[PDB]
Symmetry: D2
Subunit: 233 residues, 4 copies
């Protein structure tokens, strides 16, 4: 750990568990004030207790909720977040031959639309206030290579990568960087290790270390790319 | 006649690439079920090619299934070639993009391609039949493009969907592949102004925009047994663009 | 159509010569092994050529001899010549590295250049098709040299397409997965059983499967495809 | 990186010099290696007993001797190895000499292989963990007119690095590639103004990169913050499209 974010306000979605929680703890450790957002307000509050910081409830798949989140953060802190990390994400695995419409729609709405709506609301708040920023979207190596039983998740995560590339291209002129992180097999609540050259499963803190780099000025000429954190999977 | 045996279903068949695919597949001996949101345009395509026209909104779950049922009732077999060319753009900068402009593009381009891939695979597996599913993505799905966050997202999603589908369906003898066209003159792109359309042409090694026939030719290859060991991949038809 | 195929004496190169000659092409079959080439020719006026593609003079002379024999340049050129010399990075001899680079990468460069030079000076259009490997995209344990040489071919081919489109010449790479040929006879059956479980199509490729894709890329059906890679792997994951 | 010994090739100029400065600033001791002895030495002056080494990395004997000299000097193999030695000899494919091709392949691709190998052998024979960082280029992914040789070599470096990472993970050694875009250095000094202002229009961030931008990524890849990253490429291009 280092201290590269002493002036940062960081908004983290899916901050209530796993990678989101590890990200919140790491960014706070670097000096950032964290706006911890989760669908489950008590999970967001618990994260805040582990890190002034504040908890927010939001369903990021909802357009109204994504906008109101950003307005609430702005109200509370008197400024927009300069670091935004979209970690809210879900799976609902099924084989393509049997995937229900709810299986598909839910995953797309949370993982893809949600990331869209947060990127957008974040960028609007930064641009309207004349501020520089770093937006980091957690995708998955599955978005690059696919995975049996996960046609919905693979599509959503590929979509996040495509979204982030385009956002980077549009927002670079405004001083706003946009990057994707592609984790492999991470031990979280969401034979394999023979397939991992590093020889073990990843920890959520392994992803948070990369997110901290991308949130910091040490990546200030990095935008529109994806960084794989998979142990060489 | 590569495709003499075959029945082919083409969505978005009323226009541009879908129409050229229909013509091309019929030229190789296939019977074509030509589907479009516009029944009239589908009927027109069928006239250029017993082939039959079908009407459907592929973004709607019950319509995608009904389309496949309708074709099976008409021809007494499932289609063994299915080409998803139903697609739209609704361009806007990220900072200004409305929820409906996001939603509509994702519904038609991504959800529609999902639902058609699914219904097709289901019809084939249930009938013990081999097949080839070909989804038209875009090179913007690989690299993004300014003003098209929604489109870029949708087309990247089509590539991940197609890769995963390929992997689940190979054991059933069904191939799934994506075609990534570059800049193709169609009614989709006919509204794009010439001062930009000119500048794009300088970034094309082949020195000109593509024809729907160029995309059709790749689709016919992926439909045929000449591509029988190709699955889960994307073929770029861009003239070397970029 | 006049087609030059390097590595034509065996496996993929042989199958490509057969396929293209079946489509009406006249084939110049070239191989390090002169008897291998002649036998390819006898299996298919087609003619056999001997050359070590890794050698600059040999590559230029090959394209000289083809043009003196047919009175025109080849308008389809397929670089199938290539070797493996596998070893772990920790133990890889300089020789193991240099040979694979010389044959697979420099050889493909030399032939791509010599072919392009002949086409452009003659005012002829063409399609150059370079056989890389899926390993050039994802790498493979024991094959640091091969993976580098094959990734190299992909970079060379992308750049070559960018430079040559304006002269009516297309340049593409084919990336096969596991294809049953003499190059893969050494692979243990116990390893092949494993690999096969990871091919969604459920079987190894035949050289004919690669030849089918080369014929498409040789033909004008692929006339707006340049600077790209086509994977022929059965979905190998 | 207080503990660490870093070997940087191409350390006499540009990105290699920036990386040396950056690693030193984080507490590493730097073995600064260059074809030009004088340039390596000035880097050392510009910089915990840092030392200058001369080697032509494209020669197998010079790459093994380099690592032996480093180990003899420091009693330890370098645990961070950054291959920045690299050249261009640009020409159109139709006019490109055998020498222009050969030199670029030898330095950029064979040199990176030999140094990666020598570093890995030294680390493994001593039971030590490390991080090998190879500077490739965004042109290795997408190609570039007039640089058939450079593009082949940088694509080769990516393929080399992926494979190395898969073989060496089991020994505690990471291998990653850095893909810089358009960086202001003596390599790109001869690119004319008009091409540069046009290029700048292709960069979402709206300016050229600095050798320190690249050095910052290298320090990340050298540190334990990147402990679960191996066999991948990090792009530092400002969004260059
Ligand atoms: N864990 C892995 O192996 C892995 C691998 C690759 C990618 N990822 C991705 O990383 C991100 C974090 O995953 P994780 O492993 O920490 O999962 P997790 O379940 O531990 O955390 C996800 C958090 O997202 C929150 N969330 C879900 N829907 C939400 C919504 N609509 N609005 C707000 N919050 C919502 C949940 O309450 C939960 O707190 C996700 O994008 C996930 O897909 C995880
Ligand atoms: N034209 C290009 O430059 C280009 C480039 C890359 C990718 N593509 C893709 O190629 C495919 C075909 O595009 P095109 O150029 O033929 O456009 P087009 O407008 O000429 O053809 C699209 C057809 O899709 C039909 N359609 C629209 N919504 C539908 C729905 N919900 N259900 C069923 N049919 C529907 C339309 O009625 C139309 O007939 C699309 O997926 C497009 O995104 C086009
Ligand atoms: N077989 C596979 O599984 C596989 C997979 C991916 C890629 N490839 C590639 O396909 C191409 C052909 O492979 P194959 O499987 O047909 O192998 P093969 O060994 O059957 O054929 C190779 C031919 O290359 C010729 N050759 C070797 N060096 C030469 C040189 N310097 N000059 C001229 N000719 C030379 C040999 O004499 C031989 O006839 C190679 O580039 C190979 O790397 C093969
Ligand atoms: N500058 C850019 O825009 C850019 C872009 C992409 C990639 N790169 C890569 O970054 C690395 C550093 O480039 P740079 O811009 O700092 O170049 P530079 O010319 O400033 O420095 C390269 C250094 O390598 C040394 N060198 C050359 N050949 C050598 C050899 N055989 N053995 C040992 N040392 C040798 C040179 O003398 C020089 O000191 C190179 O691999 C380059 O290709 C640079």
């Amino acid at each position: 750990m280092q201290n590269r974010l002493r002036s940062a306000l960081a908004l983290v979605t899916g901050a209530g568990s796993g990678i989101g929680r590890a990200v919140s703890v790491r960014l706070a450790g670097e000096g950032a004030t964290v706006a911890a957002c989760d669908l489950d307000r008590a999970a967001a509050q618990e994260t805040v207790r582990l890190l002034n910081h504040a908890a927010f409830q939001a369903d990021v798949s909802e357009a109204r909720a994504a906008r109101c989140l950003l307005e609430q953060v702005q109200a509370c802190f008197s400024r927009p977040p300069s670091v935004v990390v979209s970690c809210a994400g879900i799976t609902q695995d099924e084989f393509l031959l049997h995937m229900s419409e709810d299986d598909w729609d839910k995953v797309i709405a949370v993982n893809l639309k949600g990331t869209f709506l947060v990127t957008q609301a974040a960028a609007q708040a930064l641009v309207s206030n004349g501020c520089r920023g770093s937006i980091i979207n957690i995708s998955s190596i599955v978005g690059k290579v696919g995975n049996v039983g996960q046609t919905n998740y693979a599509a959503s995560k590929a979509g996040v990568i495509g979204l982030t590339q385009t956002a980077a291209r549009e927002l670079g002129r405004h001083g706003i960087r946009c990057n994707s992180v592609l984790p492999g097999f991470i031990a979280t609540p969401m034979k394999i290790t023979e397939m991992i050259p590093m020889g073990h499963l990843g920890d959520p803190e392994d992803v948070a270390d990369v997110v901290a780099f991308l949130a910091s000025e040490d990546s200030g000429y990095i935008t529109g790319t994806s960084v794989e954190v998979t142990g060489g999977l």
